[PDB]
Amino acid sequence: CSMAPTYERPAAPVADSWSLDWKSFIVDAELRRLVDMALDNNRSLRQTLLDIEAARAQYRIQRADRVPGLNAAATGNRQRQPADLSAGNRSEVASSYQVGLALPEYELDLFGRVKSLTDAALQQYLASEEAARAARIALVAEVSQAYLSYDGALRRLALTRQTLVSREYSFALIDQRRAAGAATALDYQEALGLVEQARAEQERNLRQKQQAFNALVLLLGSDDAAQAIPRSPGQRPKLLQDIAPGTPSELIERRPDILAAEHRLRARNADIGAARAAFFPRISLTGSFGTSSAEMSGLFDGGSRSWSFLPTLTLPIFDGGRNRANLSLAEARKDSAVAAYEGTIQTAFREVADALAASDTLRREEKALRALANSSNEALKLAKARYESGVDNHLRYLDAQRSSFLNEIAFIDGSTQRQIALVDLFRALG
């Protein structure tokens, strides 16, 4: 028999609608190379891989209880008792030695208490493997995001460097106009403030670059992970621009997070089955089988055979209210596993909805960012010539140089924000 209830999956509390391989997804040959390195060597994932080895050993520990064992023991008992207590009526020293095999307390499994406990340890083992899958998904997504940011930094640094040489050469022209006398002093300072902006932004971009590089070196986790990353990155898109979201129902059966959570609920359901079997009578066997003697010299002799066999049944009648508390505790734990499962679904529903809302917005933004960057860069060139001729003051040209630079960086930003939100979608689906 087994008192564990029948497991029914709780109805997905999310709405029915929203408003596949990692190598297949990650097209870039080097990024995929990097993810393979990280997947092989990342130490946080390695801990989660050894978590499942522990969880397997716990099931193996519980499985051991279902089978009866066999132990070779030797037990001497020597004691001086009073005259008063013994049948002899004169105070005596009694000795008794035993050797041979013995059966440690073995539970007959009529109500499936141990069966149920062994089942729970399986479900947490399986929930550990689903957690290791979730971490694997999370690692690949984190390695990619860190490569996209590293790339995005290098695009900013390259832009800033071409912006710096432009403003440095453009400043040299304004300096010698004042040395002549033709240049305003305000114009000279406004051109200087431009050059320093570029130097300060280059420092910011060098920081972002190397902090992204270090984060990558960590996530790879090799001693040679600094060598493995290319200093000059391939500028082609690294991932599939479009992914179909699918039904939320498919997500529930697909995503490791969900599978880890349902398996926890199954373990908790098995736990109920153990609480129920405690109310029912426990039966157990103890056994000893070997050779008993009165002296050390009489144990390796003929006809010294001896055995003990002890079956015992026991049924709790009165507790302090313990078994019903154990039942109430296992049920509360189960109800939490259900709420956990429901909440884990609802979360995953929100994480993909966010990734879709982002991806829809970011495709539509990046077109506005490019066209503004082109509108700014042409307005820069018109305003350049308007100052350079001498029609308008330096301010318009100055303001256009700021706007050009801001808009061109803000594009590099929103392009990288589009590709990262794409991998966030691949993670959130699973």
Added chain:
Amino acid sequence: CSMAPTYERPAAPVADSWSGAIDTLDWKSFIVDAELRRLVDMALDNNRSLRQTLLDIEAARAQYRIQRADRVPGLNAAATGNRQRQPADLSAGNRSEVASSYQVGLALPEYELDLFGRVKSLTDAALQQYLASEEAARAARIALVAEVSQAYLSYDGALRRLALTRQTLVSREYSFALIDQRRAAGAATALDYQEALGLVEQARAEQERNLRQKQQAFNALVLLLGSDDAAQAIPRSPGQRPKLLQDIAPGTPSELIERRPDILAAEHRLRARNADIGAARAAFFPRISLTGSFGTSSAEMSGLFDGGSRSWSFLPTLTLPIFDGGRNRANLSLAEARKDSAVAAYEGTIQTAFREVADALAASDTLRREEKALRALANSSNEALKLAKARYESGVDNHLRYLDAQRSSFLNEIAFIDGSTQRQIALVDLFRALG
């Protein structure tokens, strides 16, 4: 005879009052917005994080009942058989004897008589942990009331910014069409068209930003509500700005000590450790263990229920340790160290509550003044843009004044929404911090 120390509440390590510029009110009294109350009620009834915290109250009660069950004697029905081959030298018969012994009846598992208050201490400890969980749930409740209000205002802000960004986009494209017709004729220069073009392209990108924000804020607000019926519950119209009471009197910190759940839970977790000392104390003293059986027994099975076959056993056992390996002392050291850690915790949560209320107080009077400044700033920019258009229509001034005046009128109007939003979120933070 409970050996737990007499519990005195640790003195509060915070200021006797709050620095710079009624708190008996209900959260429904605090939240004037009837829509927001409906959303928060739905969150209260359906959220899963709160559900999980309420359910480990249920766990904590059961754990108390398992310790409370240890206090009272129990009774098992039992049936035990024993068979054994005893050899001649140990046996009374002087020949190899096989003896069986089947017995059946009621039995008493090892019962500890609580003279020294050991088990009562453990039971008081488990009770206190249950009362802590009760307060931990009252906290989780308040946390979620705040999180819903913060999420709903953040969402209300995101659509209110979207609403200005689209109206600005329309007037943006309309003013570009006028410069497009002027440039098509050949009067207006290539730059005045290009500057108006880029600026329309910029306002396109900002609308997308605000769209994503409201969608992400919608999603986060849906999860909080945690219901299948959630998307229907949320308004797409922005409610009237006074969604909560603007004026609250925080009172002293000493009033906060008795009100705020986090603290009261931490106090109960302290009381739990005072008890645990009483258990470690009592373990030094003797332990009186009682077992007993009662019913029938025999050598053969058929004569179990037989006349004059009554067989019982009554075993009291007393044990007191002279020496171990300093374990009982090591166990009292542990319990005293954990008591102290609970005092530090209790005090550490009060200090933390202090910071939180103090931040909320500072934020709320700075954002009041900042809001007035930002509203006045945006209005000067808005009228400065009116005057920059007059200068452009007259032709007396360049496009660049008219460009700066609409960038800065747009940024200042965005910043005012952010500033108005941030203030009322701080009133929620002040409600959250006071408990």
Added chain:
Amino acid sequence: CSMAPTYERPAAPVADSWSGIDTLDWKSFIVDAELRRLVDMALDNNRSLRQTLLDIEAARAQYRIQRADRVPGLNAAATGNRQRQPADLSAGNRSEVASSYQVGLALPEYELDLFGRVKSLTDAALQQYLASEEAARAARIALVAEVSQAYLSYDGALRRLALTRQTLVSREYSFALIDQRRAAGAATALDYQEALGLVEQARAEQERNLRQKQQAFNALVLLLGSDDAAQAIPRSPGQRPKLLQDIAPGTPSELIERRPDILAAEHRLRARNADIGAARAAFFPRISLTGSFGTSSAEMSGLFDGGSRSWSFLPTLTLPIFDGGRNRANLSLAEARKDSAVAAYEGTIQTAFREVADALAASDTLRREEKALRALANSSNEALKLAKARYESGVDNHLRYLDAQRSSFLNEIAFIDGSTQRQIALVDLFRALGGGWDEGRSLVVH
């Protein structure tokens, strides 16, 4: 005789250098006398530190508990047993009600660890408390750093406030000139609105700076964790730089030996190497012995009497031929757990490398960024004076003056932010490095 394998330090999983502290302690590192006083104050009365210190005294106790199991105990005891039995079961062949009593010293359940399982469990608990020490060293260094940062943020906010107020008063004077000119008809209504805008920007900025100051203050009060901490925080900026600007990082091989995080993990690893020795010891047989000494009698009166002296002595040996695969599974679990601790030890060093790396990169780039930001600041301030003269002549429209005022104020804030952020990066570097040699022995006070 402990059968656990010989402990060997895992080779460092990162390169031998950083692409381009022993002597330095926190009191040497922090130059400002006022900040030193703040750090001292938090170290005494910080409650999160206090908790991690009491976690050591708890871990010591649990080491003392496992030690206890290693030596034999002895205890006094009084055992009564009254029992009825029928004739068919009694050896006397009659309705017998026999009683017995015992009083005296009992030795319970002592285990001779010939194969050494209990010593290994004692080693595990020893290392756990040695990790608990290192853990609190980290938490203390982290406290130093956190108070330092919170003060540096506090300092910075007072500077932004000072500027904002200076800026603000200039804007109030400038506007009063234009309010008069627009009253006279000498300035345009658009110039008057722009000037009013400038005033409000700085007014709103004042309020932002005040919150920033007060929240950083409230954080400091918390970290100090004292009733009288608020009085101990300086109300005015520290005149000069408050830390040493140039810290030499040393190798990563040195960081392994110094940094608390790494050593905490190392002790935990060594604790799991012991738990393997305990699982290996489970395969060999368990020798348990029990004994008694005292007086026993049939009736309660006869207890303490001549010829009542009774003793008990029973040693058991227990070897399992079959388990259920449990002793194998325990060993597999002990190997798994040890392997996770080794990976944790590696991951800690790797994570320390990233934090150090990020911190030097931050320090060096912010050095140069600050110089550039200083150069940009006073460029925009000189151009402010020129644009002011150019506007006041009537030569230019207001926009050039207005834009210079905006740019100067925004660049001067940006310098304060950048400068304070460099100092916060110097603190982040100190933490990531993890202090000099054996920075703290506040931990071992018992």
